[PDB]
Symmetry: C2
Subunit: 527 residues, 2 copies
């Protein structure tokens, strides 16, 4: 079969990337009991056994192949526009119930606050269990990843697109239930299945709760006495400990670390780190403690992440390192760094070579050194044959983050974290936590622990991009971030009261009571 | 063997690409009697048969594997720095002899105009003959390509990097013989050969004459009266005929069509096509004709190419179509064009969706219409299965070049062309030739008839990029451009005397005899 042959070929290539570029392979083998061979063999058999397999069927197989790695950074996307969609956003409450937190339609049979009980007659958890990956381990992160999928099916992601009408069973706020008949918003496939055309191909012949939300989903913490509304959501409000004293608390939400992707971002105006700077300065002299909302963050540029950190501390902070998978590629990069920084001795020379600013991070002489060290260390590992999963080397060689020369918030910080915090959104609280800089509150992060790289290549299976992790981050005391993520100081999940009536008062109250303590006791959260 | 295994994997990948995304395949088979299945097996063997193959040895096999397509667009590069230079530059005058034309060192024996008889006891020819390709067919184009590397060997391009001193047997311009012993400038590899590291690798344990030159090489045609000071070498000059009669001819050289790679291009000021405008408006009002230097051009951006052509005419110019190979990626491109121009019914709407211009080409409703057509066409070949070597389709749907609405040189034009003109530098003269807009002189063009795409993918073999051709251009009369190239109106090669002392007077004279003949006639008698 034409589609079958291409799929196997395309599958063999994916298999080969895993052996030369997927770093956490050893980690996935142990922590998950994952097995490349098992995976390969199984996938090939699925492919060969099919009676006249369709293009999508194969994509679904490759999709499941990489899906088995249980890696939020490891996936495959396709050249397919076929999709199914229901305009409902649901959020799982601590006790296990599923409430509708947003309805993007004028239909009125379901309201914000109704509880989802069944889908097509099957209990939510059941439907969800058919959306999990091959090596599911029931973590909240996986659960939520699956939840995003409940009402959004895309062939571009390897999903099997449903269609037609379906029955959701809800529980209205006052106890009664209803069964609602709904129809999937369906977009038919616009890219012809190859299997359908194969036979006619003759031989050639000449002649929001949305991840990344700028505003996030938390309501103000109290009476606003300042707010920027420019590019980031940032404001200053009050609070009042039980003693009757009032404090000025700041609130800032970092939506992503992929700045070129922030809503309303003009690439002709000043970059977002310069605005971040204005916010922090306002905070420095107008606030007594800072609350950073970082939930539902997709991650992004490490250099950008570093910049934001450099402005949130007056002292240097230790950064975790990465065990990298190597190829001559990274070698030349190493060479290139050395040849570019050969003759650099002063801060000034650093700047004329690096740009004096690396996506917000200040180009210093030490940066030139750090960079120089990295690359040396890389070349070393290469000659010592340590290219399978090198000893830990910090990204860019930055052994640590050095406070920003001009702006630096030095007061107590409080970071809110989610089960939907990936990569840089993992690292941010990691760095603030290991150096004891901020109080992390909320829930264990997802655990995408290692940088991503994407791969493209022509093929007839419709593969667009295959993303893979190229390193394994190692925290200071030796823990890997991959899969495990970061645990916050205070475990504070959202309750059904927080969620049901989009107030989150129970949550916010605890955060306020918590931050008041940092203001009084000086950090040091006792009770 | 490790290096052997990776090499065979990556070879199997390049081979697969050739069957899915190499449009010229069917052509190279009939024209070069080439065979994939055969070419691949040969390299497979060249790899197995080798004892302890080096990363280098392998790169060379792949370099040669592709090199056997005799396509100036199909090539491979690597993350290797080992190079061997030599500040010298040859050129091969028409008589079939090789002469020197440049020295980039410190005063040394070898003189301008000195012939080249041998290298270390071998007659130049045979030397170059070792630099030809698996299917070299002896044409100025190929030969010139070889010559380029004769004094520049690079591992990154897949060359065996020689070293140490050597002897060039030169012949003084008057009859006497010499032999100057020289030592290549060497660059030792910085990327450790994988074969040397293999053993120690333990499993991962957890826990000028420059193709593209601005000025180019030709000397001013005569007494300069005006000259532009921008990016392009443009000036005006008197010219008398064989009757004492004087005319003001114009001169403009298009170095490359990849506008962003122009010597001194300032990415913040105006784009090169705007300077082109100014230069022409001037020419339009101070010239009786126009000479265009288009020799030594690596092609560039197809749209920019159109933009220049659109300012060099007062009537639409018929564009040659491309036979393409399709994958779902192209299909989606088609879909995306259609959803983007869905409701564009005016010029304002067009300009809004596509911008006032696309790399210089003026955006019209006509343009939006072209693009919409392009999409329907690609989609139609897909559904019909015409995906191996599509029915001819114009790039972007542009069936013809429409004159710029504001600048249009309409007076006779002369274009100079040689064997170092590729992709777009193939189209320029052919479009102007097939439409009878200009007089075309020089020598046949390279023969790179089809657009390019670059494939990158991680590997241990050190492959960096593999470029291939995604189409086969077809001229108005059915002929191709791949290999064949574009024939000039008048065959005006550079003869010994021209090169010998970089005077090219002999050549530049027959040019003006021609430019002149052009000023004295309403002539382009289209019949």
């Amino acid at each position: 079969s034409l589609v079958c042959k291409n799929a196997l070929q395309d599958l063999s290539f994916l298999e080969h990337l895993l052996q030369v570029k997927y770093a956490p392979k050893t980690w996935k083998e142990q922590y998950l009991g994952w097995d490349l061979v098992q995976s390969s063999v199984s996938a090939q058999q699925k492919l060969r056994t099919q009676e006249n397999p369709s293009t999508s069927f194969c994509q679904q197989v490759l999709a499941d192949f990489i899906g088995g790695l249980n890696d939020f950074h490891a996936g495959v996307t396709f050249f397919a526009i076929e999709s199914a969609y229901l305009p409902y956003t649901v959020q799982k409450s601590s006790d296990g119930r599923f409430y509708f937190v947003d309805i993007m339609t004028f239909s009125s049979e379901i309201r914000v606050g109704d509880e989802l009980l069944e889908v097509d007659g099957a209990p939510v958890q059941d439907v969800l269990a058919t959306l999990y990956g091959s090596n599911h381990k029931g973590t909240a992160a996986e659960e939520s990843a699956a939840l995003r999928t409940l009402f959004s099916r895309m062939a571009s992601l390897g999903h099997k697109v449903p269609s037609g009408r379906t029955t959701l069973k809800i529980r209205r706020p006052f106890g009664t239930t209803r069964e609602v008949r709904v129809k999937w918003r369906y977009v038919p496939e616009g890219v012809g299945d190859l299997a359908t055309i194969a036979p006619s191909i003759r031989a050639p012949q000449l002649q929001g709760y949305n991840i990344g939300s700028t505003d996030g989903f938390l309501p103000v913490i109290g009476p606003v006495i300042w707010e920027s509304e420019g590019l980031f959501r940032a404001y200053i409000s009050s609070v009042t400990d039980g003693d009757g004293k009032s404090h000025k608390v700041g609130f800032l939400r970092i939506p992503t670390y992929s700045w070129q992707d922030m809503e309303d971002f003009d690439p002709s105006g000043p970059p977002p780190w310069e605005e971040f700077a204005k916010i922090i300065q306002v905070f420095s002299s107008n606030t007594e403690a800072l609350i950073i909302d970082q939930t539902n963050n997709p991650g992004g540029s490490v250099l950008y992440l570093y910049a934001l950190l450099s402005m949130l501390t007056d002292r240097p902070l230790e950064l975790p390192k990465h065990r990298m998978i190597l190829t001559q590629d990274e070698v030349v990069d190493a060479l290139d760094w050395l040849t570019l920084l050969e003759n650099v001795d002063t801060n000034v020379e650093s700047r004329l070579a690096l740009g004096d600013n690396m996506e917000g991070y200040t180009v210093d002489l030490q940066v030139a050194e750090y960079l120089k060290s990295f690359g040396r260390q890389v070349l070393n590992c290469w000659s010592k044959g340590d290219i399978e999963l090198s000893t830990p080397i910090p990204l860019f060689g930055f052994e640590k983050i050095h406070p920003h020369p001009r702006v630096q918030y030095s007061k107590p910080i409080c970071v809110l974290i989610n089960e939907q915090d990936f990569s840089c959104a993992d690292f941010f609280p990691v760095v603030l936590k290991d150096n004891d800089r901020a109080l992390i509150v909320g829930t264990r992060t997802a655990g995408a622990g290692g940088f991503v790289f994407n791969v493209q290549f022509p093929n007839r299976t419709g593969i667009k991009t295959c993303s893979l992790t190229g390193s394994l981050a190692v925290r200071e005391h030796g823990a890997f971030i991959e899969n495990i993520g970061v645990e916050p100081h205070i475990d504070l999940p959202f309750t059904a009261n927080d969620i049901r009536y989009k107030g989150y008062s129970e949550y916010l109250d605890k955060v306020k009571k918590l931050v008041c303590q940092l203001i009084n006791n000086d950090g040091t959260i006792i009770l």
